[PDB]
């Protein structure tokens, strides 16, 4: 691999390990291979957001052109967010597309993803369904995102009012995970969620 | 040929063009006068967004026609 790519990643990996943000358990990174082309990241959900108390793992692939192109980052841990696909974990963020600069690092990417969680841009969505709900019904989006933080990301609390609707459909014989996804995507309409599950 | 381009401010940009000019050329002129990047510019005439490769003459755009400019900040 190119010496500049290898040296940059080795430097940036240690900077994350030694960081104040890692000592506070906000971010971390681990190696996957021996060659430094695949990494696994973890970020904590930010405070005063639906993602609080959740932990989100990230697939990080380093291009042969690093540091002049951005890493490819994907959410492994499912998340309900306008700028992250609830199906694939693909991320819409300018620094991972057209506003990467070579001075950016693993640290600043991980921190930027946390800032994205704290401040969505629903007018440039990755997930049109999540974005529609974010704008049309803020309180539902927040409770749905918190439910997903609990179900997928280990966040402690989730909301009793959704529990009831989840249990009804679960009692129809549908899988709890499928029920969660159907009800979230149909904005908690039992009837259209049931229709989806029946297909 | 003189044409006008209206913004949502109300501000009218006056441009000098030819019927043979493409829509991207018109956007390049708008950049020269107003410092607005062409990839942020959507030009509208007769209720329809105009496309970059076609000319003013293709759209029946004439002397003292008024286009509309809406700024759409990229959004990939």
Residue numbers in the entry:
A (entry chain A): 1 to 199
B (entry chain B): 1 to 76
From the paper:
The ubiquitin conjugating enzyme Ube2K (also known as E2-25 K and Huntington Interacting Protein 2) is a Class II E2 that preferentially synthesizes Lys48-linked chains on monoubiquitylated substrates, or forms Lys48-linked diubiquitin in the absence of an E321. Uniquely amongst E2 proteins, Ube2K has a C-terminal ubiquitin associating domain (UBA). The UBA domain is not required for the synthesis of Lys48-linked chains, but may act to tether the E2 to ubiquitylated substrates thereby enhancing elongation of Lys48 chains. Here we show that Ube2K is a monomeric E2 and the position of UbD is similar to that observed elsewhere, while several key contacts between Ube2K and UbA orient the incoming ubiquitin.
In order to ensure the formation of a stable isopeptide bond between Ube2K and ubiquitin, we mutated the active site Cys92 to Lys. In this conformation ubiquitin is locked in an open position and there are minimal contacts between Ube2K and its conjugated ubiquitin. An overlay of the UBC domain of the Ube2K conjugate structure with that of the previously reported Ube2K UBA:ubiquitin complex has an RMSD of 0.48 Å. When the two UBA domains are aligned, even though the same residues mediate contacts between ubiquitin and the UBA domain, ubiquitin is rotated relative to the standard ubiquitin:UBA interaction. Even though crystal contacts may help stabilize this conformation, this structure suggests a more plastic Ub-UBA interface than previously reported. The apparent dimeric configuration of Ube2K~Ub did not suggest a catalytically competent complex had formed, as Lys48 of the UBA-associated ubiquitin is ~30 Å from the active site of its partner.
